[PDB]
Amino acid sequence: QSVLTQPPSVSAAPGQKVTISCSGSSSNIGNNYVSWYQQLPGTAPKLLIYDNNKRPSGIPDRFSGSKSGTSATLGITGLQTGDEADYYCGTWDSSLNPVFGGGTKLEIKRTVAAPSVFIFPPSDEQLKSGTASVVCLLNNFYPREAKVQWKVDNALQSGNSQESVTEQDSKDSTYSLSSTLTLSKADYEKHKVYACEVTHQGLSSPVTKSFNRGE
Amino acid sequence: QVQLQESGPGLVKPSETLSLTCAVSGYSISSGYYWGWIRQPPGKGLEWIGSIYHSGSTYYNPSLKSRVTISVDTSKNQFSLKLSSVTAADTAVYYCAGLTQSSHNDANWGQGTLTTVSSASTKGPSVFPLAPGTAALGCLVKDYFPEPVTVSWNSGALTSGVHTFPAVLQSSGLYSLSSVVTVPSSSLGTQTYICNVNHKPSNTKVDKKVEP
Numbered sequence: 371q372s373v374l375t376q377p378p379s380v381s382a383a384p385g386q387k388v389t390i391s392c393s394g395s396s397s398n399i400g401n402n403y404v405s406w407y408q409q410l411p412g413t414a415p416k417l418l419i420y421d422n423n424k425r426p427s428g429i430p431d432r433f434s435g436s437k438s439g440t441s442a443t444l445g446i447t448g449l450q451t452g453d454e455a456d457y458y459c460g461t462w463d464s465s466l467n468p469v470f471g472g473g474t475k476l477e478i479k480r481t482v483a484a485p486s487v488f489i490f491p492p493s494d495e496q497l498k499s500g501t502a503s504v505v506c507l508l509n510n511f512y513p514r515e516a517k518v519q520w521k522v523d524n525a526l527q528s529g530n531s532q533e534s535v536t537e538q539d540s541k542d543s544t545y546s547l548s549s550t551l552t553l554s555k556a557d558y559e560k561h562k563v564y565a566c567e568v569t570h571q572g573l574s575s576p577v578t579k580s581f582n583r584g585e
Numbered sequence: 586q587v588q589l590q591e592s593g594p595g596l597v598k599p600s601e602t603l604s605l606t607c608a609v610s611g612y613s614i615s616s617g618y619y620w621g622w623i624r625q626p627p628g629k630g631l632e633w634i635g636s637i638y639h640s641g642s643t644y645y646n647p648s649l650k651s652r653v654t655i656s657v658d659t660s661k662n663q664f665s666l667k668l669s670s671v672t673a674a675d676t677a678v679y680y681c682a683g684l685t686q687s688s689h690n691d692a693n694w695g696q697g698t699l700t701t702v703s704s705a706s707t708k709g710p711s712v713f714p715l716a717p718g719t720a721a722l723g724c725l726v727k728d729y730f731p732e733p734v735t736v737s738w739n740s741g742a743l744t745s746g747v748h749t750f751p752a753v754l755q756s757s758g759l760y761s762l763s764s765v766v767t768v769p770s771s772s773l774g775t776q777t778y779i780c781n782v783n784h785k786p787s788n789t790k791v792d793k794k795v796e797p
């Protein structure tokens with residue numbers, strides 16, 4: 371999909387500045403105006419800069435652009451947690467067709483925060499349908515690296531869980547993570563102790579949340 | 586304001602034709618300078634598809650040109666995209682967009698609609714509760730296809746502390762997603778918590794109360 375090259379990610383603390391580069395060729399950036407877009411998660415791109423360096427109405431002067439040669443740069447000063455987003459550059463190519471960069475994710479640096487951990491047994495409603503999903507939630511932690519280990523009657527589970535992680539929170543810059551252990555109903559009823567053990571830089575030792583089936 | 590709204594998300598089978606429309610409110614379609622479409626494959630960047638100008642002239646991405654048709658329907662005040670002979674490489678969020686006057690800087694964008702090209706079939710979810718000074722509770726939205734599902738809490742009244750996770754594709758070929766929220770433990774006995782799930786591809790909406 372992408373034609374222009376951007377770094378995959380940039381990061382800084384609130385109040386700091388970042389720059390995001392966009393590198394092209396003489397027949398795209400070299401000859402044409404560059405535009406920049408912000409894409410907050412789950413939303414459409416929103417124009418930040420057009421004609422290399424101009425801001426549309428509504429965009430504050432913390433955003434700026436420039437173009438030099440076959441490269442362009444977006445600057446963001448006074449970083450806020452709301453600026454967490456993907457940023458894209460765009461220009462026209464030798465056919466005057468629109469082309470994009472591949473995007474840069476901006477991550478906001480913050481203090482270490484340990485996750486709060488919760489475990490949820492399968493619902494009776496799901497067990498009546500024949501399956502069991504056990505869910506472990508790691509809420510509002512930083513940095514993003516975390517490890518969840520499942521144990522069922524002290525057996526370490528490997529390969530029968532899946533996890534996903536939120537985008538960085540727009541207010542407090544943390545992440546949250548959900549991990550689901552899936553078992554058949556028959557297997558779920560063969561074991562008693564279900565445990566989620568969490569390792570994270572914010573935790574001086576791993577935290578385990580557990581329950582006993584039916585107790 | 587001017588609003589653009591793509592038709593709803595879903596599934597198209599390989600070799601078949603993807604058809605999307607974009608309804609325009611707040612601007613006459615025949616007055617617009619150009620209308621067009623851009624897509625975003627999942628986890629990737631933006632890719633222009635094509636545009637139709639006020640004149641009626643069209644310009645398409647050269648790599649897609651043989652498969653693309655963009656047109657305007659002035660009675661519906663809408664424009665369309667047809668993309669024939671689709672494959673999994675056409676799976677993407679499709680956005681419509683237009684520049685209503687050539688002097689405008691900002692185009693107006695739609696919200697994006699995810700089209701999945703797959704030989705699998707549409708399946709609606711089951712919604713299960715994740716029952717609960719701070720308590721967590723949630724909904725597990727299991728066994729649906731294709732993406733996406735949306736989840737709100739308390740009809741949009743509850744937003745603080747909500748986390749709706751990316752879905753995972755299970756080995757069965759179906760997606761599963763969780764949505765959680767953290768609330769005061771004291772509120773569990775007095776505040777009702779309902780997750781509002783919508784799976785537009787299967788036309789499945791469920792409002793599930795989560796009880797302590």
Ligand SMILES: *[P@@](=O)(O[C@H]1C[C@H]2CC[C@@H](C1)N2C)c1ccccc1
Pocket residue numbers: 405417420459460461462468469470684689690691692
């Ligand atoms: P971008 O979506 O274009 C904006 C800003 C300027 C240029 C066209 C219209 C909408 N405005 C008049 C864009 C530009 C180039 C490549 C990709 C995207």
Ligand SMILES: [Cl-]
Pocket residue numbers: 416417690691692693
């Ligand atoms: Cl725009």
